[PDB]
Write a protein that binds this DNA or RNA. Sequence first.
RNA 1: UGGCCGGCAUGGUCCCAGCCUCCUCGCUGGCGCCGGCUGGGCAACACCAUUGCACUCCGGUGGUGAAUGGGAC
Length: 95
Amino acid sequence: PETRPNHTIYINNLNEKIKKDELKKSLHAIFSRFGQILDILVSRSLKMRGQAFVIFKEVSSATNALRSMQGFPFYDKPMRIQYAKTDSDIIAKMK
RNA sequence: UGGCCGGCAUGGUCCCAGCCUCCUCGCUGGCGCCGGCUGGGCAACACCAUUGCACUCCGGUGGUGAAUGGGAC
Ligand SMILES: [Mn+2]
Ligand SMILES: [Mn+2]
Ligand code: NA
């Protein structure tokens, strides 16, 4: 069951050996060109490792980042991007 | 030694280089041998498991079962 467009893009299949701080840094490095980023959430917990939530200010950016970077080799692995099932709080607190 | 103990071996204090380690990374730490008990912590490192949709920090296990020489007194 696919997901509907969202301000936030959910990414997984990310190299799990990368420290949280760097992963956010590097993600920002390759995603900032698609639009203003409000935040990037990463957690190395058993359940949230290898995944990340890039929160774009404008949905169009999210869509671009999704179409263009899908499959992109990052830290030796192909990035698998989707739209986040639900809105991130940062977005809720506005729209 | 992370904390504690037993057997044995072993002249001494320094100085230079090298090497070692999860538990005060280095020169007012350590670098003979053998055996047993034992606590903390995943922070780093490694290994195992994990493809997982969050906005609550939170998987497990392992390491010391470690590291040599040189020189002045
Ligand atoms: Mn030590
Ligand atoms: Mn030894
Ligand atoms: Na861990």
